[PDB]
């Protein structure tokens, strides 16, 4: 379960984004080819050198997120596809973030940000036309954690490459709702560390019980958002049997002495067919059961 915290390619995703230095550097592009106006940010000061260009996102509330994943979708043009400019041209860009308990507004200070990684392209764009008709879209993803503050900024630094940013998707992972072992487990946040495996408590479904001497149901949430290593289980209580992940009353003519995994048993020999959802079957008239004998026993005739 991926819960998205900010999506650039979406309505108003460009929102409150900022460029530094003021003026040139990163710039907001518009593409109106489809009836939908689409947006991107690009920079191509590959001839100039001494390039330090910053694009900061809006301030995004992290909410319950401990670890955030950042999904970037970009194109890089070739440095030598530009007549004689490689002397100052680069083909990577740098991904920065900053944690912040307040929205700083239009304030930006490079020094407050922390380098997550160099972002580099898997496929380069080589075109002979100044305006490249066909693009090679790259997809890269990084993670940071744990987050400690109310929100955070993302910023992108260009060192002199020819980059276009089409999509910035940042999300956190969660373990979904689950029915397992006749217990309902609630939607749980994931952990930030790989060794982190918290325990989450199962709620026996209607007409299910944790056995008198047995482990209560635990599940563990992982970093990917997949549950792991079930501990214990609930059981369909007496008079009920497991049907899918619910507990159903025994059919008339069946019984179940106690909570177990097994289905209801047919009423034993020399008994009266039981009503719906019974624990034991009554002895047929004129027959009896030995008092030491459990109700699963057949009844014998009264001597």
């Amino acid at each position, epitope marked *: 379960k991926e819960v998205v915290l900010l999506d650039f390619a979406a309505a108003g995703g460009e929102l409150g984004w900022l460029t530094h230095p003021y003026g040139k550097g990163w710039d907001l592009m*518009q593409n109106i*080819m489809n009836d939908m106006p689409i947006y991107m940010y*690009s920079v191509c000061n590959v001839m100039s050198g001494d390039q330090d260009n910053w694009l900061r996102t809006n301030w995004v509330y992290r909410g319950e997120a401990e670890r955030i994943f950042i999904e970037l979708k970009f194109t890089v043009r070739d440095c030598n596809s530009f007549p*004689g400019g490689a002397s100052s041209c680069k083909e990577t860009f740098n991904l920065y973030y900053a944690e912040s308990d307040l929205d700083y507004g239009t304030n930006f200070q490079k020094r407050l940000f922390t380098k997550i990684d160099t972002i580099a392209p898997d496929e380069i764009t080589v075109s002979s036309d*100044f*305006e490249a008709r066909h693009v090679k879209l790259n997809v890269e993803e990084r993670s940071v954690g744990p987050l400690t503050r109310k929100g955070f900024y993302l910023a992108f630094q260009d060192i002199g490459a020819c980059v276009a940013l089409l999509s910035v998707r940042v999300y956190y992972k969660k373990c979904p709702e689950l029915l397992q072992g006749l217990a309902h487990f609630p939607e749980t946040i994931a952990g930030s560390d790989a060794p982190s495996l918290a325990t989450v408590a199962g709620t026996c479904v209607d007409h299910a019980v944790v056995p008198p001497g047995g482990e209560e149901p635990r599940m563990h949430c992982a970093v990917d958002g997949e549950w792991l290593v079930p501990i214990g289980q609930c059981l369909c209580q007496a008079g009920y049997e497991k049907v899918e992940d619910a507990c159903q009353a025994c059919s008339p003519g069946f019984f179940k002495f106690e909570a177990s995994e097994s289905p209801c048993l047919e009423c034993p020999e020399h008994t009266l067919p039981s009503p719906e959802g019974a624990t034991s079957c009554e002895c047929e008239e004129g027959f009896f059961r030995a008092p030491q004998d459990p109700a699963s026993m057949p009844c014998t005739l009264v001597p």
Partner: antibody
Amino acid sequence: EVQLVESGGGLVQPGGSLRLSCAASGFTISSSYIHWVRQAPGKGLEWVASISSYYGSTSYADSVKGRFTISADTSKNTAYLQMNSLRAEDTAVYYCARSHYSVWWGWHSVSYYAAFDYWGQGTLVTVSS
Amino acid sequence: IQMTQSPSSLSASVGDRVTITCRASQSVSSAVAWYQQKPGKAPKLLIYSASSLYSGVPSRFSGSRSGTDFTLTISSLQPEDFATYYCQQGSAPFTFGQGTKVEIKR
């Protein structure tokens, strides 16, 4: 005030050469495309050539490729069109114009694109004996 | 690509609504530009990015897109609006339309 000024036009014999000049002021060429568009008398606007002085890219209309070379000189903030092998069909008013360039086809700067927003006044080239 | 203008020329009275259409041969970028050219003078930009009114241009001019069909509109034709109008591909070949000559009927 942004300004583009053509000169170099005039009367030239068939097969001759003429070099046009587009003197820009009020802005620096490096930030934009510099175009040449031509209008044969009684005819429509024909785009002909373009240059980005920052990137050094050049492109031409087919009617012109191989015979005309557009260039630029960042120092004088001026663009030129060298025309060779002129024919009667090249008789036209030659305008120059600017536009914001884009490295990505189909994309425009939200704040800086305004198509061919500023033009020169034109210089007449007449190819005749 | 090619860019076809319709009609080739037209006549209208003052205060008439005039509509000029530009049709793109193939699928191009939708950043069609519109220009007004007085005989002997440089073209003047009217509309850029198919619908944006260029600074200074009177609001009677407007640009619209309906698929492959780009239209320039003059809501209230003024005597000073006599000119030739050109749509233009606002992308790589920058190709110009065939033009439409507009004369004022009186």
